[PDB]
Structures are given as C-alpha cells and as structure tokens.
Amino acid sequence: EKTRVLVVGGTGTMGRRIVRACLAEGHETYVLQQPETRVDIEKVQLLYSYKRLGARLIEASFSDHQSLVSAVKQVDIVVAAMSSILVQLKLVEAIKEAGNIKRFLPSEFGMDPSRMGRETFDQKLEVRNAIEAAGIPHTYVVGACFAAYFAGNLSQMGTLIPPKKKVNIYGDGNVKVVYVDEDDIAEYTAKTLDDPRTINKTVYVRPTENVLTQMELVQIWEKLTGKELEKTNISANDFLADIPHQAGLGHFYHIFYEGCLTDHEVGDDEEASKLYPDVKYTRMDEYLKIFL
Amino acid sequence: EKTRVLVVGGTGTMGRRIVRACLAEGHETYVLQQPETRVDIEKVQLLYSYKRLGARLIEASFSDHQSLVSAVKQVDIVVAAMSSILVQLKLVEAIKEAGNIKRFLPSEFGMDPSRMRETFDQKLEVRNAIEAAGIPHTYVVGACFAAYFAGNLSQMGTLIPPKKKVNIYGDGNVKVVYVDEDDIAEYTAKTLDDPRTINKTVYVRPTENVLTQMELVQIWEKLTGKELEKTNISANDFLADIIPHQAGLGHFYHIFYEGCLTDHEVGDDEEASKLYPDVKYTRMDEYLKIFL
Numbered sequence: 001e002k003t004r005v006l007v008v009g010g011t012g013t014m015g016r017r018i019v020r021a022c023l024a025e026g027h028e029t030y031v032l033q034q035p036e037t038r039v040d041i042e043k044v045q046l047l048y049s050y051k052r053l054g055a056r057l058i059e060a061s062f063s064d065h066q067s068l069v070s071a072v073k074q075v076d077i078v079v080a081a082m083s084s085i086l087v088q089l090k091l092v093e094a095i096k097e098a099g100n101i102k103r104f105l106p107s108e109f110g111m112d113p114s115r116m117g118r119e120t121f122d123q124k125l126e127v128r129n130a131i132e133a134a135g136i137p138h139t140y141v142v143g144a145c146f147a148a149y150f151a152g153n154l155s156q157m158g159t160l161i162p163p164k165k166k167v168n169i170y171g172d173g174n175v176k177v178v179y180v181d182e183d184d185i186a187e188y189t190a191k192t193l194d195d196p197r198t199i200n201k202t203v204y205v206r207p208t209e210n211v212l213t214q215m216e217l218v219q220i221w222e223k224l225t226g227k228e229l230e231k232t233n234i235s236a237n238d239f240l241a242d243i244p245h246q247a248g249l250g251h252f253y254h255i256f257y258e259g260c261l262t263d264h265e266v267g268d269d270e271e272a273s274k275l276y277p278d279v280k281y282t283r284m285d286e287y288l289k290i291f292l
Numbered sequence: 293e294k295t296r297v298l299v300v301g302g303t304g305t306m307g308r309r310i311v312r313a314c315l316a317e318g319h320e321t322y323v324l325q326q327p328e329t330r331v332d333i334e335k336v337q338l339l340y341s342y343k344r345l346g347a348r349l350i351e352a353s354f355s356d357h358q359s360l361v362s363a364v365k366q367v368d369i370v371v372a373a374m375s376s377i378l379v380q381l382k383l384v385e386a387i388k389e390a391g392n393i394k395r396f397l398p399s400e401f402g403m404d405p406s407r408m409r410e411t412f413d414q415k416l417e418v419r420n421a422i423e424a425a426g427i428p429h430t431y432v433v434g435a436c437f438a439a440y441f442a443g444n445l446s447q448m449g450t451l452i453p454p455k456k457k458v459n460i461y462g463d464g465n466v467k468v469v470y471v472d473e474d475d476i477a478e479y480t481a482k483t484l485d486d487p488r489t490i491n492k493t494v495y496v497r498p499t500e501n502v503l504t505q506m507e508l509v510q511i512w513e514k515l516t517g518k519e520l521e522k523t524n525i526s527a528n529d530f531l532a533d534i535i536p537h538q539a540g541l542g543h544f545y546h547i548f549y550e551g552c553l554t555d556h557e558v559g560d561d562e563e564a565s566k567l568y569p570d571v572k573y574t575r576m577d578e579y580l581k582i583f584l
C-alpha cells in the first residue's frame with residue numbers, strides 16, 4: 001500500500017535528495033540507472049548507495065523507448081529532476097503508452113516558467129504541453145531559490161560560500177526573494193506527489209520565514225559573524241551590462257530586480273509550507289551556520 | 293592527546309574516505325580547502341559536511357607557499373591523496389620549512405613505484421624529495437581499489453559487472469590484490485601514528501583478497517548462478533597498446549600479466565591486515581553483493 005515512485009535524474013543535485021526523501025517518506029523508491037553512468041565513479045557509487053537505503057535500480061536508456069515503457073510500468077508515480085530538459089518528452093511518450101502512471105512531476109523546481117515572457121522557460125513549457133496533451137496527471141513544484149546557489153553565498157556570483165569582507169547588493173537589496181534549502185524542496189516534493197489536494201496543480205514552495213530580501217539575508221549573516229560587510233550597490237542599468245551564460249544573469253535579474261519570485265500571492269491550498277506544516281523547513285540563519 | 297591530521301585532497305575518491313576514517317579513528321581531523329573548490333557544488337557540500345562530523349577546514353592554495361606553511365603548522369601529520377602528483381613537491385617544501393610535522397604519507401595507495409609509466413617517476417620523485425628533506429613518512433601501497441578493478445570484474449570502460457561476456461587476461465591465474473577503498477582508508481588512518489610503521493612501506497595485502505581474475509570472476513558466477521562467456525587475451529595481443537592515453541594500459545599489464553602486486557612475499561610486520569587485525573576488511577564475495 002506504499003506508493004511506488006520512479007526518480008529520473010537521481011544522481012543530480014536535486015535528484016539525489018528527491019530519492020532520499022522518497023525513501024524517508026516511506027515510498028517504494030526506484031531509480032533510473034542510465035548506461036552512461038557506467039563510467040562515472042561518482043554516479044555509480046551514488047546509485048548503489050541508494051540500494052543500501054532500500055531503493056531499487058531500473059536500467060533504462062532514453063534512446064530505447066521500450067526500456068522506458070518497461071521502467072514506468074513498474075511504478076505508480078514518476079518524478080524527473082534533470083537539468084536535457086527536453087529528454088522528458090521521451091519520458092512522456094513512455095508514460096503515455098504504459099498507461100499506468102497516476103502522476104508525473106516533471107523537472108521544475110525553479111522559477112515558474114509559465115510566468116515569464118529565456119529558453120529554459122520555453123523548454124519546460126514544451127514539456128508541460130506534452131504532459132497535458134497526453135492527459136497525464138501532473139504536479140508542478142515551483143517558486144524557490146536553492147539555498148546552495150543563492151543563500152550560502154549571499155547571492156554573490158562565482159562562489160558558493162559567504163564572502164570575507166565585501167558584498168554586492170543588487171538595487172537597494174530590498175526585493176523579496178524566496179530562499180529554500182534544497183532538502184526541504186525535496187521533502188515537499190516527496191509529500192506532494194501522492195496528495196489528492198495537489199493533483200494537476202502547481203505547488204508553490206514559499207516557506208514564509210524564508211521570504212527575505214538580499215539585505216535581510218546579508219544581515220542574517222552579519223548577526224552571525226558580528227562583522228558588518230562592505231556593501232556596494234549595483235543598479236539595474238549597471239547590472240544589465242551583460243554585454244554564453246548571459247542567461248544565468250537575467251534569470252538573476254528577474255529574481256533580484258523584478259521580484260519574479262514574490263510579485264504574486266499564492267493561496268494556502270497551493271503553498272507547500274501550508275500544505276505540509278509538519279516540515280520544519282530550514283530557516284536561513286540555521287542554513288548559514290555551517291559556514292561560520 | 294589526539295593526533296592532529298591534515299588530509300590533502302579531501303574531496304577525492306580516496307581522500308574523502310580518509311577524512312572519514314581519520315574522524316572515525318578519533319583523530320582531530322583537518323581538511324585543506326583549496327580556493328578552486330568554491331565554484332563546485334559537489335566539493336563544497338562535501339567539505340562542509342565534514343564540519344558537521346567534527347572536522348575543521350583550513351584555507352590554503354598550492355600557489356601560495358606561505359598559506360601551505362600556515363596550514364601544516366596546525367597539525368602533527370599530513371596525508372595526501374591527489375591524482376598533479378608533483379604538486380606534492382610544494383607540500384614537501386612547506387612541511388620542510390614548517391618543521392613541526394611528525395609524519396607525511398604521500399599519495400600512493402596503488403602499485404609500489406619503487407619496483408617497476410610516469411605515474412611512477414612522479415611518485416618516486418615525491419619520495420626522493422621527502423627523504424631528502426628528512427621528513428618521516430609511511431608509504432601505503434599494494435592494492436587494487438575494488439571499485440576500479442573488482443566491481444567490473446577487471447573489465448575496462450565500465451564500473452559494474454558485465455551481463456554476458458568477460459575478457460580474461462592470459463589464463464587469468466595471476467594473483468591480484470582486490471581491496472575495498474574503505475579498508476585502505478581505515479588502514480591508512482590506523483597506521484599514520486603507529487610507531488611500528490614510521491619510515492616503512494606498509495603493504496595492504498589482506499590475505500583472503502589475494503585472488504586471480506578467474507577467481508574473482510568465479511565468485512561473481514557463484515553469486516549470480518550464470519556462467520559468463522570468457523575470451524582469453526594473450527600477453528602479446530594485449531600489448532597492442534596501439535592510442536596515447538595508453539599508460540593506464542600497461543599499468544594493467546604489470547598487475548594482471550606480470551603479477552607485480554603479489555610476486556614478492558611480505559612480512560607480517562609490514563602488511564596492513566596483520567598490523568591491524570581488528571579491521572574486518574570486506575571480502576570480494578561481500579563487496580560484489582551490492583551489484584546483484
């Protein structure tokens with residue numbers, strides 16, 4: 001009577017946490033094992049370490065439609081976490097022929113691509129159209145900054161840890177951003193995937209106490225270190241000198257200058273911390289303590 | 293009272309295991325934090341995960357001689373696990389000026405380079421600098437990492453067992469040493485402050501893991517109950533190293549055709565499993581079970 005979940009992209013940053021959260025949540029957890037992983041000592045040891053935690057491995061290849069069909073027949077629910085976004089179209093074809101899947105959560109976990117208007121959003125929307133054209137019930141998990149990419153570095157670029165003296169502030173740094181521990185995004189995902197309340201819904205991950213401006217985040221760290229940092233404000237115009245990964249920038253712009261993560265309300269029936277209040281999500285003062 | 297150990301190369305395949313073995317052995321454990329790691333989400337989270345287990349991080353760079361001196365002045369013992377092998381020469385210079393280091397274990401762990409393409413020259417060149425500087429050492433040698441040679445039944449281009457076919461090298465009756473990387477790490481952690489191994493080579497040659505390739509294959513066949521289709525590759529055929537990545541071959545040749553890991557006996561006073569009989573090392577029938 002356990003839900004059976006196949007995780008596609010199980011050795012990625014988000015993928016490995018979704019695997020563990022599915023196990024932790026009591027699901028019968030299956031991980032897609034792709035042949036290319038056979039030469040990667042990192043991927044191999046991760047996959048087999050899941051086996052010790054009680055997961056099962058299913059060998060399949062995206063270029064072998066029948067192995068995908070055969071993999072998805074063994075489960076009730078499929079989650080993908082890739083970033084190769086469009087390889088999910090082959091997954092949709094498999095799910096459609098198999099016929100037995102109760103829910104597919106595609107590889108979202110970022111800004112809601114339906115709210116933009118770059119090619120990251122196009123490709124997730126292309127995957128969404130196929131999901132819906134095939135009549136596959138779905139849940140889209142959206143709306144958060146990964147703490148590892150945006151909080152641990154106080155939203156500076158080119159680094160993943162907090163800076164020593166100086167920090168760039170974007171605008172007045174008073175634009176609200178949503179900073180979430182990837183583990184919590186994973187736990188929210190593992191709880192939502194068989195929840196009747198969220199079938200065919202978008203679930204917004206917006207834990208209330210993690211709705212913070214860059215300056216509030218910076219001040220969380222100054223309080224932890226006792227040292228104030230040397231701040232340098234950067235304006236929309238100066239920033240938009242992007243003259244490549246010009247696309248990362250400008251995802252950044254939408255988050256930190258336009259407030260795309262917070263410029264719209266979300267109901268309690270569609271917000272993960274309200275849906276799953278027993279998830280004691282990591283506040284950002286806790287998340288940052290590891291760096292002291 | 294604890295030995296203070298600095299692990300260099302602490303996010304590597306072997307280095308991460310050594311970090312954990314040192315902590316598990318009760319050593320006050322330090323890990324070098326190189327600046328280049330700052331953009332790699334993988335290395336960063338490994339590094340900081342060690343802090344939760346009680347380890348400390350030391351920031352230093354191989355191009356900053358005085359940062360390396362500041363690092364080693366904080367510990368009693370340095371262990372390196374690198375594979376770039378000649379960056380250890382800068383480490384030797386720093387240790388030499390520091391003056392406080394009681395033992396250095398260089399990045400060895402594989403074939404003994406004192407017998408015996410440039411892998412060996414570089415390791416021998418590191419040993420020479422160590423001994424010239426009069427730095428006390430222990431050289432841990434003599435084993436095949438299971439993940440690279442046992443999990444794949446010693447085939448190439450893959451890290452998991454093959455489904456139907458296997459290449460056998462010669463008759464496959466040359467004795468080889470297959471060792472779980474975790475046991476190499478635990479032996480290293482137990483030996484680095486052992487008075488018995490100061491200025492010695494310690495051979496990691498656990499008695500029951502001295503196996504021919506055919507014996508390794510046969511362990512697998514008894515676990516699966518499937519006989520593999522075997523193809524014998526002769527010593528002369530193999531030396532078609534046509535493809536100048538070819539030193540990886542040839543290393544293989546010395547192990548599997550010439551038996552260089554097992555052709556000289558070793559005394560109990562210099563073999564890891566006799567020096568540390570409380571280490572219940574993983575046998576290959578147990579190691580291979582995870583792949584069933």
Ligand SMILES: NC(=O)C1=CN([C@@H]2O[C@H](COP(=O)(O)OP(=O)(O)OC[C@H]3O[C@@H](n4cnc5c(N)ncnc54)[C@H](OP(=O)(O)O)[C@@H]3O)[C@@H](O)[C@H]2O)C=CC1
Binds near residue numbers: 037107108146
């Ligand atoms: N704060 C934010 O806004 C963040 C949001 N995200 C979102 O995370 C989601 C997942 O990304 P992430 O967690 O970072 O993980 P990764 O980018 O590290 O995903 C790695 C896994 O993706 C699989 N993969 C990638 N390309 C292919 C391909 N062509 N063919 C087959 N498999 C492939 C492989 O799975 P396998 O293990 O089976 O080999 C690989 O292990 C994305 O949707 C992204 O938008 C992530 C970045 C920041």
Ligand SMILES: NC(=O)C1=CN([C@@H]2O[C@H](COP(=O)(O)OP(=O)(O)OC[C@H]3O[C@@H](n4cnc5c(N)ncnc54)[C@H](OP(=O)(O)O)[C@@H]3O)[C@@H](O)[C@H]2O)C=CC1
Binds near residue numbers: 302400441
């Ligand atoms: N069965 C056998 O015979 C085998 C034996 N080995 C031996 O294992 C020992 C450890 O190697 P391995 O685990 O494979 O190493 P890895 O390639 O996994 O890397 C380990 C660390 O090396 C550091 N590193 C690599 N290059 C540089 C460089 N130019 N400058 C600074 N740092 C560098 C990095 O340190 P950091 O983590 O700090 O960022 C890296 O993480 C080797 O001596 C190898 O000969 C190798 C495979 C199997």
